[PDB]
Amino acid sequence: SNSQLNAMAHQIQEMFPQVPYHLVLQDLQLTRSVEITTDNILEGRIQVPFPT
Question: Cα–Cα distance between 12 and 16 in angstroms, integer?
Fold first, then answer.
Protein backbone atom coordinates (compact mmCIF):
# COMPACT_ATOMS: atom_id res chain seq x y z
CA SER A 1 0.00 0.00 0.00
CA ASN A 2 3.03 2.27 -0.51
CA SER A 3 2.39 2.94 -4.20
CA GLN A 4 2.49 6.70 -3.56
CA LEU A 5 5.87 6.45 -1.86
CA ASN A 6 7.20 4.27 -4.66
CA ALA A 7 5.95 6.72 -7.27
CA MET A 8 7.44 9.71 -5.44
CA ALA A 9 10.87 8.10 -5.40
CA HIS A 10 10.56 7.79 -9.18
CA GLN A 11 10.86 11.56 -9.63
CA ILE A 12 13.89 11.61 -7.36
CA GLN A 13 15.44 8.74 -9.32
CA GLU A 14 14.88 10.82 -12.42
CA MET A 15 16.53 13.89 -10.94
CA PHE A 16 19.23 11.90 -9.15
CA PRO A 17 19.91 8.61 -11.04
CA GLN A 18 23.09 8.33 -8.99
CA VAL A 19 21.22 7.05 -5.93
CA PRO A 20 19.56 3.64 -5.28
CA TYR A 21 15.81 3.62 -5.89
CA HIS A 22 15.07 1.32 -2.95
CA LEU A 23 17.12 3.35 -0.48
CA VAL A 24 15.13 6.35 -1.62
CA LEU A 25 11.91 4.40 -1.00
CA GLN A 26 13.12 3.97 2.55
CA ASP A 27 13.54 7.73 3.09
CA LEU A 28 10.06 8.21 1.69
CA GLN A 29 8.97 6.14 4.68
CA LEU A 30 11.04 8.39 6.89
CA THR A 31 10.03 11.78 5.56
CA ARG A 32 7.34 11.02 2.95
CA SER A 33 8.61 14.17 1.25
CA VAL A 34 10.69 14.03 -1.91
CA GLU A 35 11.74 17.60 -1.16
CA ILE A 36 13.31 16.41 2.06
CA THR A 37 14.46 13.05 0.68
CA THR A 38 16.43 14.87 -2.03
CA ASP A 39 18.11 17.17 0.50
CA ASN A 40 18.41 14.11 2.71
CA ILE A 41 20.46 12.44 -0.03
CA LEU A 42 22.68 15.49 -0.06
CA GLU A 43 23.09 15.36 3.75
CA GLY A 44 24.34 11.82 3.42
CA ARG A 45 21.11 10.42 4.82
CA ILE A 46 20.95 8.16 1.82
CA GLN A 47 24.29 6.52 1.14
CA VAL A 48 25.15 5.31 -2.33
CA PRO A 49 26.64 1.79 -2.41
CA PHE A 50 29.13 1.87 -5.25
CA PRO A 51 29.76 -1.18 -7.50
CA THR A 52 31.78 -3.64 -5.49
Answer: 6
